[PDB]
Amino acid sequence: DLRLHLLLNTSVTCNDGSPAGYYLKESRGSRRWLLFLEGGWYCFNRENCDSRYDTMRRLMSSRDWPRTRTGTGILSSQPEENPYWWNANMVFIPYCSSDVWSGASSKSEKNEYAFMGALIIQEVVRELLGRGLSGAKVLLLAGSSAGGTGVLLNVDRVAEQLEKLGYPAIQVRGLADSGWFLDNKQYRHPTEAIRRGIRYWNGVVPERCRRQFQEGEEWNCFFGYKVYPTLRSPVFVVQWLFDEAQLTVDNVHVQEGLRLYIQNLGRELRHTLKDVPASFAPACLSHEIIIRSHWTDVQVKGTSLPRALHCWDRSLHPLKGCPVHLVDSCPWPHCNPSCPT
Numbered sequence: 001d002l003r004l005h006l007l008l009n010t011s012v013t014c015n016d017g018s019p020a021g022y023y024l025k026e027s028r029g030s031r032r033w034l035l036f037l038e039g040g041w042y043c044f045n046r047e048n049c050d051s052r053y054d055t056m057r058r059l060m061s062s063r064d065w066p067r068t069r070t071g072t073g074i075l076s077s078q079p080e081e082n083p084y085w086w087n088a089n090m091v092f093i094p095y096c097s098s099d100v101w102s103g104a105s106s107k108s109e110k111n112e113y114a115f116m117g118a119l120i121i122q123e124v125v126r127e128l129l130g131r132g133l134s135g136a137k138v139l140l141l142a143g144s145s146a147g148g149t150g151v152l153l154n155v156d157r158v159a160e161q162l163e164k165l166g167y168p169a170i171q172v173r174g175l176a177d178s179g180w181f182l183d184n185k186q187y188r189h190p191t192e193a194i195r196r197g198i199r200y201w202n203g204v205v206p207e208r209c210r211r212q213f214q215e216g217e218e219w220n221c222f223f224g225y226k227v228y229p230t231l232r233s234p235v236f237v238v239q240w241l242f243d244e245a246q247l248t249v250d251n252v253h254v255q256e257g258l259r260l261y262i263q264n265l266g267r268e269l270r271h272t273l274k275d276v277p278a279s280f281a282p283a284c285l286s287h288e289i290i291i292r293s294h295w296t297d298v299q300v301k302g303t304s305l306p307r308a309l310h311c312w313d314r315s316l317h318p319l320k321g322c323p324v325h326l327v328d329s330c331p332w333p334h335c336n337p338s339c340p341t
């Protein structure tokens with residue numbers, strides 16, 4: 001079990017002003033640290049944040065969080081469940097900022113809510129340095145869904161933070177699960193919600209990407225295929241080719257028109273990953289994977305996700321029999337027999 005710690009700097013807060021925090025299980029025989037960002041959509045104005053506060057309050061407040069959480073999947077300490085990193089130090093960072101981990105705005109007399117996701121990540125890193133992170137060899141910042149997009153937005157800022165604090169030996173890397181979306185045409189009739197959100201949150205994006213797209217166009221940096229080329233830290237991308245959240249936003253719930261739409265979506269996703277050397281993209285209809293208990297089951301070309309991540313670790317010291325770029329070529333959901341049922 002991972003144990004809750006509320007942030008000692010109580011000015012770094014969830015949406016409603018309660019302290020943010022993290023859940024931790026230390027492994028004193030290991031110099032590997034895994035910091036996982038939870039997902040859970042977002043809110044973008046007063047009225048829809050108020051609705052979220054009524055029925056999704058754990059995503060906006062720490063007042064009701066439990067003392068412990070069970071580590072599952074990549075956060076599990078059991079070798080049978082986690083062949084990749086079972087002996088690592090484990091951290092689960094709850095998502096209570098509703099801002100895709102991008103915000104840097106405090107509650108005030110003009111702001112009903114605080115959007116502090118980017119600051120929460122940096123404060124967790126700071127407080128962990130006193131609990132053993134100072135001795136780390138590798139810090140892997142991982143996340144699923146909104147947390148996966150959060151990895152892409154924040155991994156280089158964590159690398160910069162540690163360099164500036166005097167820890168240039170810690171190797172910072174990212175693992176983005178189910179956060180790689182396409183700003184495509186919908187099947188039936190979007191990006192305007194992200195544009196409004198960024199202004200509402202005082203959202204921040206990585207430097208190089210912001211310099212490319214410039215003022216007013218920072219929403220572009222929330223799309224993996226546009227922000228990834230600007231990143232300096234190594235990032236492994238996990239994305240189902242027919243992601244359920246992508247299809248929901250596309251208004252897809254089979255005749256020729258829909259068949260061609262679905263096949264084109266898989267082809268476009270595969271194209272965006274052609275030049276991503278560390279990636280895992282199966283031809284399945286699903287959403288999220290890395291903290292699911294059965295994340296060991298899926299395979300692409302005969303290689304499981306835990307194996308591909310281990311091969312990635314070796315590459316950061318092509319490898320015979322140990323691949324790191326694994327993207328399905330078959331064009332319909334569940335043409336891969338190992339897809340989740």
Ligand SMILES: *[C@@H]1O[C@H](CO)[C@@H](O)[C@H](O)[C@H]1NC(C)=O
Pocket residue numbers: 009011012119
């Ligand atoms: C607490 O966090 C806020 C926001 O990041 C920062 O302005 C302040 O300096 C921090 N306090 C300390 C003691 O580091």
Ligand SMILES: COc1ccc(-c2cc[nH]n2)c(O)c1
Pocket residue numbers: 181182183184185186190191194245246249250
């Ligand atoms: C699931 O996340 C998504 C998926 C798709 C879009 C999008 C934007 C324009 N077209 N489609 C998005 O903004 C978020």
